[PDB]
RNA sequence: AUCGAGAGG
């Protein structure tokens, strides 16, 4: 497990990574420095020798090139220091250790490998910068971030090895994952935020932008679609332009909260034959959702069409967003004056609730709930009171946000952010928690030496009334830091324990494969399951189906 | 507890019921009590369910507990993976934990077994008990640097 | 002169501290709604007052601008990064023979400074630049 | 602007990092665990200055 | 005057020009400022040979300062690119050699300004290579400082270049650019809290255009044709010649395409 | 190649919704009663005030790419004030001898109900809409 | 260089947490990440 | 560690405006905003070059060789 | 032990070729093609040995066999001509 | 009713309505014999195991039972004619699609399912981080390393 | 280290033509021209002047990668109209408008007094 | 990074022409995403932009000290006096087209710090090179021009794909592959083998 | 090569 079962290996590389919107999903951006380093043995056929001789002629100092020549007798030829680096006579049965070249299969890895989708094969695209370039929609299976992460890359050395990479471990094959029986890749931040603003009914695109947006799609028919609006000014909808990226023969149906077939507020999603009918596009349509658009295109059209569909959506939406623009400032965190007054009034009435329950418990008029003490019931009631307070204030803020609010736009697109972030930033961060309880009496009968002893008030036990916009008091800041320390401790402890948990799981089930009778077995031949998954089917080709026989009256079933 | 149950029409309807939750377990004594349903009672301690209701009810309790652990955070895993883990724990007749004295004391070769934990003691006892390894395991062929009997190596290839 | 005492963790079990000297002013309306909610300190029998609460933070946390407007793991995360930001570490860098040294060409004092920077000499020895930053979506790089 | 507080050993500057310890000669009470036979324990870390 | 684009100059000086570009396609106005930034050429220092540097600044620090110094490039058209000249390394028809010698003779600290640059190469009578000094005191750009005993002796070879290769060959600082200060075209959706009119400031160019009639609806087929621009020059070329050489470089860049179409 | 529907409606209700360029409109035909329509207009191009009255038409023409108008002599089939192109996506039988037709002009939706169109309006990609004055 | 000199190491029942007694005598935020977090703190 | 030649954002030459900045500060007893306005630095991108500058060269001179 | 084979009749293994045996077939074919082996398809200008092996697979001109082993020790030989590819 | 199963029939029916252009006025050309006998032969041809012994064929009928329930529910005669309005051509194409997609959905022998299972549990557990019951990673460690001394043993009594 | 030399934004390399013109598959009168060593300064202007021509149907430019300085421009015209002629007319119209701009600006500058 | 945990690598470099610009001709030195903002709740970044803008216009410093009575409303009231929009929003124009950005951009000065980590000090490729002595495996680290670790976690992950021959190659051909002579009597490798 | 320290995800 340190030398056997895990080794440092030849033909390996790592670098800082960054993301390229104008790369393909299966493509990896390989620097020329690395591409001039890593080699592949190519045997001299009649098909390659006219290219291999020119590669050897170029030498190991520019990227289309080679480093070593292996003769049939077995003595290596170093092209960096040799006489014969210009007058080589290639004969069949020799090997040329050529450079990495474009559209080569490589393994691509992000180092916590808790996934078969953390090492995936990739097509090489060679780029002139030192970073590994990759598509944004391949981040989530690797759990990559471009804040300084480094990624590994391995290079096959034989034809069966490249076949195993390209035909089993390729990126478009691992789109629908056996875990969660759903697509692991999807549209991510900028594309997800811009595809919503593109698909609004207000969003109309003039001819000059429509023509470039059409030409941006790689596999195009060359047919300009008929515009939506014709007479007063010929205009297109973003729904009309985006549908060129969707291949003909796609049908997607989706209904949600309020969904007529006239669908006011553009809820749901209806797509027929590579054209959408109604629906604002967002995360449930185009994200990693089960039964989503990537699920449909991967299942029906295939993996390659879906992988090209990723880039086709990305290019159009990134172009429209680049020429549209989008930002976020502190004005996106500021609610109305009346809304702030109503929010602090809500916090004040929660404070009065806490005072009244405190006095009721102090007069020994409290009713003991069965199974718990008086103080447990008191702590439970005050904690539930302050949680209701911060949630009501956050919803009071989220009502007050406009449709132009950019945090609200990122929430509505599902790109980044949630409701609790708006609550903590604009209205109230709320109540800090240590070991499941409020801020404990670290001092004798108090939390801070600025409080009198035996103070069970919200401020004393760590309720933080002010928001991140308004500013925390010193006590509030210290209690927030006291909670955040436990948060970072829990993060480190979770990682350290879960690595061992995953290792024990894998080393326990490492020998379990389906044999050639669907009997799930191990090395001994002991049967774990007689049919794999109790039905003998792959979790990749599995979707959520409704069974119309289960529900409803016997009368409607009869009808 | 809210609950859905069929109406006499057949349509499912909400029939909420009073349900007791405890703080301990001696389920062998608790189900033999009047006024409860002994066909429906359930423990979060799957090991007592294995000891009381047989090993196959321990399978379902173990799966339901792992499922609740996963679905608490909101994540989905497919049935086959958790069922594989459960059946691996349950095939040997009783609950076989995932530990150095759980699965890793089985008859599953020796070089695979020495790859997890207690490497030197396992190699010593395999040398002492005169163990033989079929090398059908993955880790045996990883150690031997051979094409393991796995997906692309489960078979031979010859000519017509 | 007895205007200041040295209080440690055990002795401060027995004392009552005011947070700011406005807490000793007596009490008796129209209030700017943008300010924070400062609780009326109902205690009245103090032994001490804090000098300034900003002194609870270390050297690296006193660099952070508005850390009372940020969540606490962010203030933690930055304090490990400022020990990796380049700048003039000393003015005799052209005399010493350190195994690795990194100096910024044109260091800049920040446009937003804590008052605690002046005792940390950050404006006299800065480690970054007032970059013109736009937060926008632009070709998705 | 240099502040001092460091040592120069073999041309390399070295810092003695402050060590944290529990104080000596203080009386403390530990309520022991449930399967422990002794219920409570009074410990004092005795040391001379 | 002549038909096509129309210019009305609001204000002018030797360092700023403020004008109105009327009846122009917008892509022409965009490519105008793009070329006005990037592609019109200028002479600036591209090699430094350092003989003595006893200063506290590294030599590459000094060379980076020196490359950014504005040198006169009025007659840069009569100077060829060093890649285009037939010389060995650099000659009088492609390069201009300055030299710099300074000693800390004074007890007080002695400054090195850009005025201390000494032209060595034969200019052959063209307005080229003079470091532009807009300072009120006549001293150049403050390049370095020295105490007693410190000296600096180096030789700078300046060459022709455009701002695409390096921003030191940038001839203009900032291009002010505004079209439709009323947003009668609705080319952007304003961000507001209560009222977009009060929360957004009114531009000065709103004076030079009629306010929209709220009773009249949105003009569908109106396009952007009137533009409000301001060009500032660092002093390498004057402000008129910045935009004139931008227009001429754009014309020449289109002409090279027209010529390659013929050659194809 | 001909007109598949003609009527005249009076708008009952105008609703901006959460949109600034698109209003949902609700009208009923004054020529033939009990035939109504709900339709998404762009009010920026064609302002539609409430309690107005306007003609509504649907054609089949007057595939291939979109050439620009390019000339005054390219024979437009429109002296109308607002024309759109759409696609029928559902036919609804509300009752026997009654129908409701569902169109999408690239997101802008259309409900049209009644039973006068009992010899046309098939499920066809070709779908126009013309509104007059 | 400043933050290295005021560094406290704690080798080793809840030590890593920010205790209430730490108010004013140690930095609440300045501490390492992950492995040995909260043991090393700067005053 | 010394005055930059030109602004990073704008490109306007600022290296010749340092001594004039300090003379407008101390000789004329002005504040920093009116000094930056007098030197023709109107955009704030140009202003942060001079306002946020620490002239560390004056310390580097103090070392004798 | 001796001739533990399953005859051609009475075979229960899947006639559909799995992706793993497909990838092994394409790999071994491109391996032998790389070392100057005879090719059994009129190649339409294709030069990549993997595309050559794939087009040989679509035209069924690959004379290899798959010996699918069974946990009792028995096995089933399947020619590429028998195996469906999907 | 919503459960993870093989071949999606909503997409197959919508693809059949679009491929063969379907009108909702003209009647079909499907005898009842075609629908019922074709569905019952399709159930025979949805193959998972291929032994001709009684045990393996019984395991085959058991392994397809849920999917066959779904298939009979969605390919009922009134559902086909009254709701889908399928022609004979579209019906036989639906049968071919269902059979081929099912045969694609079978597991491939050799696939290491245990490592995939263990990683499929380990990944969300690595993101599991945060009503007084043991949940998350400590409960998962209790489950994995068999917990005789459970922190929160409970008993749900009905 | 890895970054290309900065003159590759405008300096034509070894064997690199300026314009490379290729026909379009599944397009009647369309053509795609790879402009080498160019940016949006030329592409946006050529395309916007092309769209003013009445006899041209389609004109659009795209930058396949901001790393390399090059762009593809596709033009589609009417029958009997070579798109190269439409490109030439657009370029000459650009040069005429630029010359008129330069002359009017020189007039207005010489009118000014500072 | 900045002073608020907002780490980030340079994804690409644009010039001033391709950079978006305001009507004052100002360009950003830096462009960050609005998507890093809400999930991390770093409001001090967004207040630092505003206070630094008003300090650069006023020529004064920014009192960004903690526990002050400085309000975002007061900073906005200050900024509106200086002719800009009170929330730090600026009408910005596209760099490629000059067409106005439909949304308005959060623009301002902000203290950013250049971090210790750089690419060329981290980049590494080995393909073939030095080996260790005891294990005959590739040496550790890039400072010795060594190999990247094909970990046992990666071995599990590659078993999950079923890539058998790739796994054997990575564990033999790209590492310490070796030939040993053994016998059938002992079964151990004590065979004295003189090959020639 | 051993031991140890700091740091990145
Ligand atoms: Mg990271
Ligand atoms: Zn020359
Ligand atoms: Zn500037
Ligand atoms: Zn022997």
Protein architecture, described:
With 559 residues, chain A is an alpha+beta fold. Helix content of chain A is 35%, strand content 16%. In chain A, the strands form seven sheets. In chain A, strands 3-9-8-11-2-10 form a six-stranded mixed sheet. A four-stranded antiparallel sheet of chain A has the order 4-7-5-6, with helices on one face. In chain A, strands 16-17-18 form a three-stranded antiparallel sheet, with no helix packed on it. Chain E folds into two domains: 1-41 and 168-264, RNA polymerase, RBP11-like subunit (Gyrase A, domain 2); 42-167, DNA-directed RNA polymerase, insert domain (RNA Polymerase Alpha Subunit, Chain A, domain 2). In chain E, 19% of the residues lie in helices and 29% in strands. Chain E has helices at 26-38, 59-67, 196-199, 239-263; strands spanning 6-12, 16-22, 41-53, 71-73, 96-103, 110-112, 118-119, 128-131, 144-146, 151-162, 172-178, 227-233. In chain E, a hairpin with a 3-residue loop joins strand 1 (6-12) and strand 2 (16-22). Chain K is an alpha+beta fold and 114 residues long. In chain K, strand 1 and strand 2 (30-36) form a beta hairpin. In chain K, 35% of the residues lie in helices and 24% in strands. Chain K has a four-stranded antiparallel sheet with strand order 1-2-4-3, covered by helices on one side. Chain K has a single domain (1-114), classed as 2-Layer Sandwich (Gyrase A, domain 2). The chains are: A alpha+beta (559), C little secondary structure (141), E alpha+beta (264), F mainly beta (133), H mainly alpha (65), I alpha+beta (86), K alpha+beta (114). Chains A and L meet through strand 1, strand 2, strand 11, helix 4 and helix 5 of A and helix 1, strand 7, strand 8, helix 3 and helix 4 of L. Strand 4 (129-135) of chain C pairs parallel with strand 2 (30-32) of chain L. One zinc ion (ZN) binds at residues 85, 87, 90-91, 93-94 of chain E. The structure holds one RNA strand of 9 nucleotides. The PDB classes it as transcription/rna/dna. The entry lists the keywords RNA polymerase II, elongation complex, DNA lesion, transcription, TRANSCRIPTION-RNA-DNA complex. The entry is titled "RNA polymerase II elongation complex with 5-guanidinohydantoin lesion in state 1".
Radius of gyration of chain F using CA atoms only: 15 Å
Strand order within the widest beta sheet of chain F:
5-9-4-1-2-3-8-7-6
Secondary structure class of chain F reads mainly beta
Q: Briefly note the structural class of the backbone of chain H.
A: mainly alpha
Global Rg of chain H: 13 Å
Assign the CATH superfamily of chain H: Homeodomain-like
What percent of residues of chain F are in strands? over 45%
- Remind me, CATH topology of chain H? Arc Repressor Mutant, subunit A
- The global form of chain F is globular
Strand content of chain H: under 5%
* Shape verdict of chain H: flat
CATH topology of chain F: OB fold (Dihydrolipoamide Acetyltransferase, E2P)
What gap, in angstroms, lies between the N and C termini of chain H? 18 Å
Which CATH-level-2 architecture of chain F? Beta Barrel
CATH superfamily of chain F: Nucleic acid-binding proteins
Distance between the termini of chain F: 24 Å
Query: Which molecules other than protein and nucleic acid are bound?
Result: magnesium ion, zinc ion
PDB class: transcription/rna/dna
Keywords: RNA polymerase II, 5-guanidinohydantoin, elongation complex, DNA lesion, transcription, TRANSCRIPTION-RNA-DNA complex
Entry title: RNA polymerase II elongation complex with 5-guanidinohydantoin lesion in state 1
Chains A, B, J: DNA-directed RNA polymerase II subunit RPB1
């Amino acid at each position: 497990r340190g030398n056997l079962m895990g080794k440092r290996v030849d033909f390996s590389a790592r670098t800082v990574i960054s993301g390229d919107p104008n790369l393909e999903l299966d493509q990896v951006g390989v620097p020329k420095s690395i591409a001039k380093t890593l080699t592949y043995p190519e045997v001299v056929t009649p098909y390659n020798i006219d290219r291999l001789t020119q590669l050897v002629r170029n030498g190991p100092n520019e990227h289309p090139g080679a480093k070593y020549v292996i003769r049939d007798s077995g003595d290596r030829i170093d092209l960096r220091y040799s006489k014969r680096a210009g007058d080589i006579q290639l004969q069949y049965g020799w090997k040329v250790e050529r450079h990495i070249m474009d559209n080569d299969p490589v393994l691509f890895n992000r180092q916590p490998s808790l996934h078969k989708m953390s090492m995936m094969a990739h097509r090489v695209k060679v780029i002139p910068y030192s970073t590994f370039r990759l598509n944004l929609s391949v981040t989530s299976p690797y759990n990559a971030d471009f804040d300084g992460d480094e990624m590994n890359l391995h290079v096959p050395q034989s034809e069966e090895t490249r076949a195993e990479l390209s035909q089993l471990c390729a990126v478009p094959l691992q789109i629908v994952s056996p875990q969660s029986n759903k697509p692991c890749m999807g549209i991510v931040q900028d594309t997800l935020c811009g595809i919503r603003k593109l698909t609004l009914r207000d969003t109309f695109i003039e001819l000059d932008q429509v023509l470039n947006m059409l030409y941006w799609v790689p596999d195009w028919d060359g047919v300009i679609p008929t515009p939506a609006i014709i007479k007063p000014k010929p205009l297109w909808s973003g729904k009309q332009i985006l549908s060129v990226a969707i291949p003909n023969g796609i049908h997607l149906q989706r209904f949600d909260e309020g969904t007529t077939l006239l669908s006011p507020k553009d809820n749901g999603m209806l797509i027929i034959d590579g054209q959408i009918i109604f629906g604002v596009v967002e995360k449930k349509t185009v994200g990693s959702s089960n039964g989503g658009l990537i699920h449909v295109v991967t299942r029906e059209k295939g993996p390659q069409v879906c992988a090209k569909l990723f880039g086709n959506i990305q290019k159009v939406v990134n172009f429209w967003l680049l020429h549209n623009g989008f930002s976020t400032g502190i004005g996106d965190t500021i609610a109305d004056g009346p809304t702030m007054r109503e929010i602090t009034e809500t916090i004040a009435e929660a404070k009065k609730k806490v005072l009244d329950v405190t006095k009721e418990a102090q007069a020994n008029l409290l009713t003991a709930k069965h199974g718990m003490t008086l103080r447990e019931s008191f702590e439970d009631n005050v904690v539930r009171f302050l949680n209701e307070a911060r949630d009501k204030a956050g919803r009071l803020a989220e009502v007050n946000l406009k449709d132009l609010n950019n945090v609200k736009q990122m929430v509505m697109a599902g790109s980044k952010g949630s409701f609790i972030n708006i609550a903590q930033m604009s209205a109230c961060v709320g109540q800090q928690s240590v070991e499941g309880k409020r801020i404990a009496f670290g001092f004798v009968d108090r939390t801070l030496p600025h409080f009198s002893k035996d103070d069970y008030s919200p401020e004393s036990k760590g309720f933080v009334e002010n928001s991140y916009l308004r500013g925390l008091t010193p006590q509030e800041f210290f209690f927030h830091a006291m909670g955040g320390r436990e948060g970072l401790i829990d993060t480190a402890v979770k990682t350290a324990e879960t690595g061992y948990i995953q290792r024990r799981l894998v080393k326990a089930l490492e020998d379990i494969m389906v044999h050639y009778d669907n009997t799930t077995r191990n090395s001994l031949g002991n049967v774990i399951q007689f049919i794999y998954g109790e039905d003998g089917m792959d979790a990749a080709h599995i979707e959520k189906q409704s069974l119309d026989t289960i529900g409803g009256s016997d009368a409607a079933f009869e009808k | 507890y809210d609950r859905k149950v069929p109406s006499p029409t057949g349509e499912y309807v909400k029939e909420p019921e009073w349900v007791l939750e405890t703080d301990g377990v001696n389920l062998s004594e608790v189900m033999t009590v009047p006024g409860i349903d002994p066909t429906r009672i359930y423990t979060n301690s799957f090991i007592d369910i294995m000891e009381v209701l047989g090993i196959e009810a321990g399978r379902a309790a173990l799966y339901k507990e792992v499922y609740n652990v996963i679905a608490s955070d909101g994540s989905y895993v497919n049935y086959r993976h958790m069922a594989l883990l459960v059946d691996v724990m349950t095939t040997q007749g009783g609950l076989t934990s995932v530990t150095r004295h759980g699965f890793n004391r089985s008859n599953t070769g020796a070089l695979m077994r020495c790859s997890f934990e207690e490497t030197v003691e396992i190699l010593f006892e395999a040398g002492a008990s005169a163990e033989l390894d079929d090398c059908r395991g993955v880790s045996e062929n990883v150690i031997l640097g051979q094409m393991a009997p796995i997906g692309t190596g489960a078979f031979d290839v010859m000519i017509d | 002169e007895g205007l200041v005492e040295y209080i440690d963790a055990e002795e401060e079990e027995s004392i009552l501290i005011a947070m700011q000297p406005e807490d000793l002013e007596p009490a008796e309306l129209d209030v700017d709604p943008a300010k924070r909610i400062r609780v009326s300190h109902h205690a009245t029998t103090f032994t001490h007052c804090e000098i300034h609460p900003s002194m609870i933070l270390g050297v690296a946390a006193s660099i952070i601008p508005f850390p009372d407007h940020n969540q606490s793991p962010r203030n933690t995360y930055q304090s490990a990064m400022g020990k990796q930001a380049m700048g003039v570490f000393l003015t005799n860098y052209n005399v010493r023979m350190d195994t690795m040294a990194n100096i910024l060409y044109y260091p800049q004092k920040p446009l937003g400074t804590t008052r605690a920077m002046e005792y940390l000499k950050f404006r006299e020895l800065p480690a970054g630049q007032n970059a013109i930053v736009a937060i926008a979506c632009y070709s998705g790089y | 602007f240099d502040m001092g507080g460091y040592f120069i050993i073999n041309g390399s500057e070295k810092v003695l990092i402050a060590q944290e310890r529990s104080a000596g000669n203080i009386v403390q009470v530990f309520k022991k665990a449930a399967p422990s036979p002794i219920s409570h324990v009074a410990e004092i870390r005795s040391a001379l200055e | 005057s002549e038909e096509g684009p129309q210019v009305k100059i609001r204000e002018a000086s030797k360092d700023n020009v403020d004008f109105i570009l009327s009846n122009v396609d917008l892509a022409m106005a965009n490519s105008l400022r793009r070329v006005m930034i990037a592609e019109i050429p200028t002479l600036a220092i591209d090699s430094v040979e350092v003989e003595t540097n006893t200063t506290v600044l590294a030599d590459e620090f000094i060379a980076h300062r020196l490359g950014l110094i504005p040198l006169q490039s009025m007659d840069i058209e009569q100077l060829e690119y060093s890649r285009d000249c037939f010389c060995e390394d650099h000659c009088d028809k492609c390069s201009v050699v300055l030299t710099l010698q300074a000693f800390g003779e004074s007890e007080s600290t002695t400054n090195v300004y850009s005025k201390d640059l000494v032209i060595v190469s034969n200019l052959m009578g063209r307005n080229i290579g003079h470091p532009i000094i807009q300072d009120k005191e006549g001293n150049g750009v403050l390049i370095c400082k020295l105490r007693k005993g410190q000296e600096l002796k180096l030789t700078c070879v300046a060459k022709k270049g455009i701002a695409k290769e390096h921003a030191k060959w940038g001839p203009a600082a900032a291009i002010e650019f505004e079209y439709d200060p009323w947003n009668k075209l609705k080319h952007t959706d304003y961000w507001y809290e209560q009222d977009s009119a009060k929360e957004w400031p009114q531009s000065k160019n709103c004076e030079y255009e009629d306010p929209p009639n709220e009773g009249d609806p949105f003009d569908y087929k109106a396009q952007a044709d009137t533009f409000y621009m301001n060009v500032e020059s660092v002093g390498s070329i004057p402000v008129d010649q910045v935009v004139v050489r931008g227009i001429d470089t754009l014309q020449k860049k289109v002409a090279s395409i027209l010529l390659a179409l013929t050659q194809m | 190649s001909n007109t598949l529907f003609d009527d005249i409606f009076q708008v009952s209700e105008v609703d901006p919704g959460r949109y600034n360029k698109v209003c949902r409109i609700e009208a009923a035909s004054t020529t033939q009663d009990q035939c109504k329509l709900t339709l998404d207009i762009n009010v920026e191009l064609f302002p539609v005030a409430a309690q107005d009255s306007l003609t509504v038409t649907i054609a089949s023409s007057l595939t291939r790419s979109w050439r620009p108008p390019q000339a005054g002599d390219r024979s437009l089939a429109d002296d109308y004030d607002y024309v759109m192109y759409g696609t029928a996506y559902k036919f609804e039988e509300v009752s026997k001898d009654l129908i409701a037709v569902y169109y999408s002009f690239g997101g802008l939706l259309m409900r049209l109900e009644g039973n006068y169109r009992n010899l046309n309006n098939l499920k066809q990609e070709n779908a126009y809409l013309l509104i007059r004055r | 260089t400043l933050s290295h000199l005021r560094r406290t190491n704690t080798p080793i029942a809840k030590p890593r947490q920010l205790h209430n007694t730490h108010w004013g005598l140690v930095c609440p935020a300045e501490t390492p990440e992950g492995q040995a977090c909260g043991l090393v703190k700067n005053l | 560690m010394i005055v930059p030649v030109r602004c990073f954002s704008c490109g306007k030459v600022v290296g010749d405006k340092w001594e004039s900045y300090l003379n407008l500060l101390q000789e004329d007893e002005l504040d920093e905003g009116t000094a930056l306005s007098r030197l023709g630095l109107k955009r704030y991108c140009c202003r942060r070059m001079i306002l946020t500058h620490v002239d560390l060269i004056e310390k580097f001179l103090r070392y004798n060789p | 032990l001796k001739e533990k084979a399953i005859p051609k009749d009475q075979r229960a293994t899947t006639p559909y070729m799995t992706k793993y045996e497909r990838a092994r077939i394409l790999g071994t074919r491109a391996l032998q093609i790389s070392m100057n082996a005879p090719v059994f398809v009129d190649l339409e200008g294709e030069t990549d040995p993997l595309r050559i092996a794939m087009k040989e697979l679509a035209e069924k001109k690959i004379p290899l066999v798959i010996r699918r082993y069974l946990p009792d020790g028995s096995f089933e030989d399947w020619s590429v001509e028998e195996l469906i590819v999907d | 009713a919503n459960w993870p199963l093989p071949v999606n029939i909503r997409r197959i029916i919508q693809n059949a309505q679009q491929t063969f252009h379907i009108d909702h006025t003209k009647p079909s050309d499907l005898t009842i014999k075609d629908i019922v006998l074709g569905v019952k032969d399709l159930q025979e041809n949805l193959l998972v195991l291929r032994g001709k012994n009684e045990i393996i064929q019984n395991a085959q009928r058991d392994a397809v039972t849920l999917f066959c329930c779904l298939l009979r529910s969605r390919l009922a005669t009134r559902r086909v004619l009254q709701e889908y309005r399928l022609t004979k051509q579209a019906f036989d194409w639906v049968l071919s699609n269902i059979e081929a997609q099912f045969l694609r959905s079978v597991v491939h022998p050799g696939e290491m399912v245990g490592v995939l299972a263990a990683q499929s549990i380990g990944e969300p557990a690595t993101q599991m981080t945060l009503k007084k019951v043991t949940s998350g990673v400590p409960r998962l460690k209790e489950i994995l390393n068999v917990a005789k001394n459970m922190k929160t043993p409970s008993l749900t009594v009905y | 280290m890895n970054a290309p030399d900065r003159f590759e934004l405008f300096l034509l390399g070894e064997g690199e033509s300026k314009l490379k013109i290729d026909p379009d598959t599944k397009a009647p009168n369309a053509v795609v021209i790879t402009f080498e060593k160019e940016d949006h300064t030329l592409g946006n202007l050529i395309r916007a002047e092309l769209l003013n021509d009445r006899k041209v149907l389609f004109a659009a430019y795209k930058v396949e990668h901001p790393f390399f300085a090059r762009f593809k421009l596709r033009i589609q015209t009417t029958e009997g109209y070579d798109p190269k002629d439409a490109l030439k007319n657009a370029c000459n119209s650009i040069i005429n408008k630029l010359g008129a701009l330069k002359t009017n600006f020189e007039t207005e500058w010489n009118l000014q007094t500072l | 990074a900045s002073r608020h945990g907002q780490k980030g690598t340079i994804g690409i470099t644009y010039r001033r022409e391709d950079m978006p610009f305001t009507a004052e001709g100002i360009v950003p030195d830096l462009i960050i995403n609005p998507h890093a903002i809400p999930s991390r709740m770093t409001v001090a970044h967004l207040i630092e932009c505003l206070l630094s803008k008003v300090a650069a216009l006023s020529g004064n410093e920014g009192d960004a000290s903690p526990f002050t009575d400085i309000t975002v409303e007061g900073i906005s009231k200050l900024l509106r006096e200086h002719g800009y929009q009170s929330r730090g929003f600026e009408v910005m124009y596209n760099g490629h087209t000059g067409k106005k950005l439909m949304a308005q951009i959060f623009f301002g000065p902000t203290y950013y710090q250049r971090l210790r980590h750089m690419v060329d000090d981290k980049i590494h490729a080995r393909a073939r090179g030095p080996m260790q002595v005891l294990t005959r495996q590739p040496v550790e680290g890039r400072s010795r021009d060594g190999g990247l670790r094909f970990g046992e976690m990666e071995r599990d992950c590659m078993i999950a794909h079923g890539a058998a021959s790739f796994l054997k190659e990575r564990l033999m051909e790209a590492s310490d592959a070796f030939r040993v002579h053994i016998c059938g009597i002992c079964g151990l490798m004590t065979v004295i083998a003189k090959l020639n």
